Amino acid sequence: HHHHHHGMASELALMDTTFQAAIDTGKINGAVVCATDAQGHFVYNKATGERTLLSGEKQPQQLDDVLYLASATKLITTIAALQCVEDGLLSLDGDLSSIAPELAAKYVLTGFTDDESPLDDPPARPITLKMLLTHSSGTSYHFLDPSIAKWRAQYANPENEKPRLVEEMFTYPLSFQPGTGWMYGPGLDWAGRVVERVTGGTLMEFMQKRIFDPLGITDSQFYPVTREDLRARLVDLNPSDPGALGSAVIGGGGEMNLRGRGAFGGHGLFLTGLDFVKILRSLLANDGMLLKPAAVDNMFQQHLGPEAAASHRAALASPLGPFFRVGTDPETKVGYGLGGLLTLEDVDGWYGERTLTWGGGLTLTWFIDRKNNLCGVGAIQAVLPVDGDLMADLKQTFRHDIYRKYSAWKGQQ
């Protein structure tokens, strides 16, 4: 709830020392860190701490433990969407009304009566794939726009507790006119549905052939993880999370996963840290394993138009700015690319200009720094209750100490 952009995590903290202290404090159980340059010259992979099985037996944390990505799924969904643009099944600016009529049918909630009933406005334009990937569609998580939260409570969910698909779950109005604003929301759950529809298969099938197979990734699954071989390595299948919901990653407040069915491109993927960094690296290298190099290039551009960008930058200064800033400085010029936050200026001895970065829940964070030839992912395996402020510091420790280790390694050849 506070900006942890600069302080002792930024300037002093070392992962080895800080994580280990967090373990013995009993506030985390371990961590998985994976970083690499484009060629695999510099490579840092460290699993620290312990995991607990459902039986209660303990094991040392390990680099191939299966982790809950939570919102780090959004990057992988973004790729699958861009892979459909390559094939010409979609386009970034086309009208999606045909494929996803539910989004065309959405009105823009403008406010409420004193009768407490919604005032709406029809969409000035169709909602596009690009607006889905840049959180400028107008679709917001209800916990980030009170209006949508109010509307969602009034039109109470009848408690017909049946697992719902993406379209059956994010039924709310838009928070602003398509293209004209920015707010974090289910834009990539919608995108993953669009992928399923235009391709005529499940999201997991598509991702498995177009992302995981090219990279040699076999140990992936969306929630719920039914493969017994993966469940044996699931970090979050343990006595504190006997349902493997990802409670420790999302922290308090509830779970993205609980009452859905089908894949959720916004938050649903499980994956090892080792396999996730392969994806980060294929994009750092721009090696044409997932996309053609121009398409990857297009991911590292500011994609919010003037109206959206001001809304983004206003949101970054809102009381929820800390969440949206991913550790960057409140004075660092940023935009939004296809896949995460985009640094627009350079930061000396940290993120290069046009670094893409996002995270998962409160405990996972990733970056791609093409200018400085570094990418990485750090995933804290917390213990409940998850301490949000401490997690920000632990993530900061990763985000800077990995650059520190990079500089040291470069001064050694």
- Listed by start position, the domains of the chain span 1-413
Quote the tokens at residue 392.
Answer: 């920000």
Label residues 194-225 b or e (16+ Cβ within 10 Å = b).
bbbebbeeebbebbbebbbeeeebebbbbbeb
Residue 102 to residue 84: CA distance in whole angstroms: 20
Type of residue at 399: R
* Residue closest to 259 by CA, chosen among 358, 158, 190, 185: 158
What DSSP string describes 221-246?
EESS---HHHHTTBTT-BTTBTT---
Q: How far is CA 389 from CA 112, 174, 184, 392, in A?
A: 34, 30, 20, 5
Quote the tokens at residue 239.
Answer: 């006595």
Strand partners, 346: none
Contact yes or no for 403/374 (Cβ under 8 A): yes
Q: How many residues in total does the chain contain?
A: 413
Opening angle at CA 77, ends 230 and 175, nearest 5: 125
Q: Which strands make up the sheet holding 221-222, listed edge to edge? A: 66-68, 269-272, 221-222
Number of other residues whose CB lies within 10 A of the CB of residue 61: 18
Residue 220 to residue 381: CA distance in whole angstroms: 18
Continuous H helices in 7-119: 8-11, 15-24, 73-86, 101-104
Contact yes or no for 247/240 (Cβ under 8 A): yes
Cα 18 from chain centre:
24
Residue 1 to residue 4: CA distance in whole angstroms: 9
Which pairing describes strands 221-222 and 341-343: parallel, antiparallel, or unpaired? unpaired
Quote the tokens at residue 149.
Answer: 């939260």
Among the options 71, 137, 247, 311, which is catalytic?
71
Q: Is 336 considered catalytic here?
A: no
Number of other residues whose CB lies within 10 A of the CB of residue 164: 16
Sign of CA dihedral 145, 150, 156, 159: positive
Among the options 74, 130, 278, 405, which is catalytic?
74
Contacts of 48-57 with C-beta under 8 Å, sequence gap 24+, read 48/19, 48/20, 48/23, 49/19, 49/23, 49/381, 50/23, 51/235, 51/238, 51/381, 52/238, 52/239, 52/240, 53/237, 53/238, 54/237, 54/238, 54/239, 54/242, 56/239
**Way it was determined:** X-ray
Among the options 68, 172, 184, 223, which is catalytic?
184
Q: How far is CA 96 from CA 122, 129, 174, 299, 357, in A?
A: 16, 7, 15, 20, 27
Residue 403 to residue 279: CA distance in whole angstroms: 19
Residue 392 to residue 323: CA distance in whole angstroms: 9
Phi and psi based region of residue 164 (left: phi greater than 0; alpha: psi -120 to 50; beta: remaining): beta
Contact yes or no for 91/98 (Cβ under 8 A): no
Q: Is 184 considered catalytic here?
A: yes
Strand partners, 343: 334
The conformation of residue 108, written as its DSSP 8-state character, comes to B
Q: Give the CATH superfamily of 1-413.
A: DD-peptidase/beta-lactamase superfamily (3.40.710.10)
Q: Is 223 considered catalytic here?
A: no
Cβ-Cβ contacts under 8 Å for 293 (sequence gap 6 or more): 286
